[PDB]
Subunit: 222 residues, 3 copies
């Protein structure tokens, strides 16, 4: 359509949907409780992602925010996307190590403050305050990843599995605040169509790729 | 008032409130844990429903959406209603059969995508895309009901109880996407005042009736 | 800034942030599960509160509502604040006595109807209906506190601890609907800058003070 980033919203819609289906069919048959939790958690993300990517593609997940002298297109559906799918990722990581509730409660709460303050940053009309919200949202993320290491006697399956998804996690998660800071929402260094592609690349890798790495091990079975 | 559907919003407000009270007084005395969960879940729905029906009655739960050449009155409070009360219904059904977490997580998540995409459909200005959101929301519902049967060794109390509320569930739940598709939100086949009545009839039967069928058995006691 | 209540939004921002930090550092080291839940719950509130107080301070958490012949400044971030932090308080109180799920589900649900209908009251343009929402929100709160006493064999630690925070709870919680009713949102008896101070005084005492009373006892340790 008229928006150059359309192609990347369409490709991400497509990869999120083909990914959930894969996951659905993959999930049919399974009857292991625990396994019935990663499939759930793991399948729902691009499931939710699918709808949120489609809401962007069709234009619903978009709003205009004025700042720095203009009308900046802002896809709030991302935050609705992540606010629902980041704890799924942290729940998959959490259940993985068997985290006590107090820390899981601490992770999703920092999580909604992370997405929550990320979304506040996204829609704040005062340019310099956008970077205050980023800094608090980055400190919460920066907080979560700190727990993601020394925040916690596991089986060598889930654990080695835990190294991967955590390292893929720091790099992936930390890449998100850099793309925000450099794209149209932040300094405006990188064009929205490139930022959209970077986010869809992280989202598909986060949703589908990270998905394709977790459930393909017996780290998930009880 | 000026809106012909007012009478049905007022009657539903009334039946939701008299229903929660019934449930409240009914619930006082009870000290069985499990039983303390159906009363909770079961009472809260028309409790929440009451407030959401009243917000419609008083006009707050209403917004105007342009499409197909006009300003269509849209009661978003329904989705806020269902987004909060449909998992209560699925939690009552779920706890009922004792569903593992992975499937309960899978049901509420499809559930918020169901209400979530239903609400997206409801407020999307592009007429043909409204029917795409309906189709995904119907596929999630269509998904949930599929689990509602072959998605799972129970006592003959909860189980026979489970036949009822599930069958009342498929017919009730499946009636909702038909009323949406045929009313003002969808094809506009049926007037808003008739659609409102159908929804309030399903909502009262869903909230109060379905309520009046569950807790009046020892299928709920531990 | 131009708003006289700014000073109180700035002080509350500050006290909420210094308070979470205190709590964070206090929380580092702890490895007791249960204790890892009060710190979580307890720390997150002024954590969330911090961001919501800052969103008010910077102007984001504010909207204008017309009624009684004018444009009344309304800080919706409070409800987003409380909707997220009141169940944390009730979870701290709940876990404290070890409440069965049915009642905890019943408390947060009345809770979101309390904040939920409080927020509806806050943004309703019809003046007399604002007081209907207050009355339902007060009845839910009035409901929660009723459970807060006779809504439930505990250790003399958590229990005596329970007397305090509950009594501090009724007075604190009940003070909130009085400040609402008397401030700019309600009868307009008390100026917004005084109402803001009263709420920040309750919020800081609720978030930080109530915080500073709970975790400083072994009522929290397992
Ligand atoms: C807990 C634990 C975590 C709490 C974290 C602390 C920080 C929380 C902050 C929150 C505040 C949200 C801000 C937002 C509600 C305010 C919207 O106002 C915008 C401009 O002021 C409206 O612009 C117009 C554009 C609008 C677009 C915004 C809509 C988005 C909504 C996404 C949520 C969805 C929920 C699924 C719905 C079904
Ligand atoms: C950082 C704090 C300690 C934590 C809390 C956040 C408080 C303030 C955040 C950082 C701070 C403002 C950034 C200052 C931005 C400032 C240079 C704006 C430049 O002025 C120009 C016109 O006045 C902006 O118009 C348009 C020109 C623009 C392209 C300017 C872009 C500004 C960019 C901000 C970059 C911030 C990242 C360094 C921080 C990475 C660490
Ligand atoms: C470091 C810590 C907080 C830093 C303190 C700051 C003090 C602000 O001084 C004034 C700048 O002249 C702010 O008022 C100037 C008018 C405006 C007020 C801005 C107030 C905010 C900048 C204060 C909120 C702190 C921010 C959050 C920094 C995020 C951090 C947690 C990553
Ligand atoms: C964005 C990508 C990097 C693009 C570059 C692609 C090639 C580089 C991939 C990065 C990855 C490397 C991490 C290796 C892992 C293996 C380490 O496993 C250890 C075994 O116990 C885990 O302990 C602890 C493990 C530690 C792992 C955390 C590493 C740190 C995260 C690095 C930051 C990232 C980049 C943040 C945004 C960036 C794009 C600007
Ligand atoms: C999880 C698991 C499930 C996630 C499911 C995936 C699909 C999620 C989609 C969500 C997106 C919600 C759309 C909505 C936020 C966007 C609002 O923008 C409208 C037009 O663009 C505003 O019109 C003006 C009218 C506006 C009316 C809309 C308001 C409604 C809000 C209902 C929520 C309430 C929460 C209780 C509040 C206290
Ligand atoms: C169905 C897909 C495979 C799943 C994903 C959804 C993608 C598209 C959804 C179905 C599809 C559009 C419906 C096409 C509607 C089309 C006839 C609109 C008619 O054109 C008129 C003017 O151009 C509409 O104006 C006003 C006149 C109106 C009264 C027209 C009403 C249209 C109605 C749509 C009915 C859809 C239900 C069949 C689908 C039940 C299955
Ligand atoms: C069946 C499955 C998905 C169907 C594929 C469709 C392909 C769309 O082709 C073009 C129509 O000319 C859409 O671009 C035309 C311009 C516009 C783009 C519309 C894109 C969407 C129609 C694609 C999203 C699929 C929808 C979801 C169908 C719901 C289903 C899960 C019940
Ligand atoms: C809207 C109402 C139907 C209006 C008509 C009122 C009279 C008909 C009531 C329908 C009901 C009939 C179902 C009977 C039930 C009893 C079956 O129990 C079985 C015992 O194991 C359960 O297995 C499996 C049981 C199976 C039950 C699922 C049935 C299917 C659901 C039928 C669809 C409904 C209609 C969807 C919307 C409609 C209004 C257009
Ligand atoms: C469950 C259990 C509990 C359910 C309780 C029953 C009562 C629920 C009622 C809810 C309804 C919410 C009303 C609101 C969505 C409607 C907004 O419309 C306003 C005027 O109509 C918009 O004005 C413009 C101003 C707007 C400001 C309102 C925004 C606020 C949003 C706060 C939520 C945040 C979520 C964190 C986001 C990240
Ligand atoms: C109470 C019900 C049984 C429960 C459900 C709620 C339904 C109605 C709520 C109470 C009721 C209206 C309050 C009536 C307000 C009425 C006096 C408004 C006064 O009229 C003036 C112009 O017409 C208001 O303009 C501006 C002048 C204003 C300053 C008037 C302020 C009105 C105040 C309302 C005070 C209500 C508290 C008593 C209730 C405490 C118990
Ligand atoms: C707003 C403050 C009161 C300002 C005044 C400051 C001095 C008065 C502090 C009030 C407090 C007094 C409560 C004492 C407590 C000790 C009782 O403990 C009992 C031991 O089992 C608990 O049983 C049951 C205990 C019972 C406790 C519940 C008391 C009731 C709550 C009183 C209402 C408050 C005021 C509501 C708003 C007001 C500000 C208009
Ligand atoms: C064969 C299997 C395992 C999966 C393929 C199903 C297709 C849809 C989504 C999965 C695609 C690829 C794996 C995810 C990995 C990535 C790091 C995602 C970023 C790349 C984006 C475009 C490149 C191609 C791919 C989408 C296959
Ligand atoms: C006597 C008991 C069990 C309940 C009556 C309390 C009143 C309020 C709500 C309950 C009403 C009726 C039972 C619910 C069943 C229905 C299928 C609802 C649809 C009907 C709507 C109008 C018809 C009358 C009734 C509301 C009694
Ligand atoms: C020394 C410790 C325990 C705490 C101090 C850290 C500072 C920040 C927040 C804590 C402040 C005070 C305790 C909370 C109690 C109150 C009833 C709050 C209302 C008072 C507001 C202003 C008065 C001063 C104080 C904020 C210290
Ligand atoms: C969908 C999956 C992933 C893991 C999404 C993760 C996204 C982030 C981790 C976001 C952090 C953000 C922060 C830290 C800074 C401001 C805005 C963001 C929301 C992009
Ligand atoms: C309040 C109780 C009940 C069971 C509500 C159930 C409602 C639905 C099941 C809705 C499904 C919808 C779908 C399937 C299609 C588009 C829009 C709806 C939200 C009405
Ligand atoms: C942040 C901590 C506390 C305990 C906040 C508690 C707030 C209330 C208890 C609010 C009740 C309200 C009611 C009862 C009446 C209408 C509006 C309010 C939301 C202020």
């Amino acid at each position: 359509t008229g928006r150059p980033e359309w192609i990347w919203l369409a490709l991400g819609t497509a990869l999120m949907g083909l990914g959930t289906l894969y996951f659905l069919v993959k999930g049919m048959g399974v009857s292991d409780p625990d396994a019935k939790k990663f499939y759930a958690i793991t399948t729902l993300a691009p499931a939710i992602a699918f709808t949120m990517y489609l809401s962007m593609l069709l234009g619903y997940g978009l709003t205009m925010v004025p700042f720095g002298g203009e009308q900046n297109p802002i896809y709030w559906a991302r935050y609705a996307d992540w606010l629902f799918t980041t704890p799924l990722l942290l729940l998959d990581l959490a259940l993985l190590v068997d985290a006590d509730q107090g820390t899981i409660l601490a992770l999703v709460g920092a999580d909604g403050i992370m997405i929550g303050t990320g979304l506040v940053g996204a829609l704040t009309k005062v340019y310099s305050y956008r970077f205050v919200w980023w800094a608090i949202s980055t400190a919460a993320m920066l907080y979560i990843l700190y727990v993601l290491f020394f925040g916690f006697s596991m089986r060598p399956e889930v654990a080695s599995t835990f190294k991967v998804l955590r390292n893929v996690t720091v790099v992936l998660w930390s890449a998100y605040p850099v793309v925000w800071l450099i794209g149209s929402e932040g300094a405006g260094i990188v064009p929205l169509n490139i930022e959209t592609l970077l986010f869809m690349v992280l989202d598909v890798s986060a949703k589908v790729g990270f998905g394709l790495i977790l459930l393909r091990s017996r780290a998930i079975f009880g």
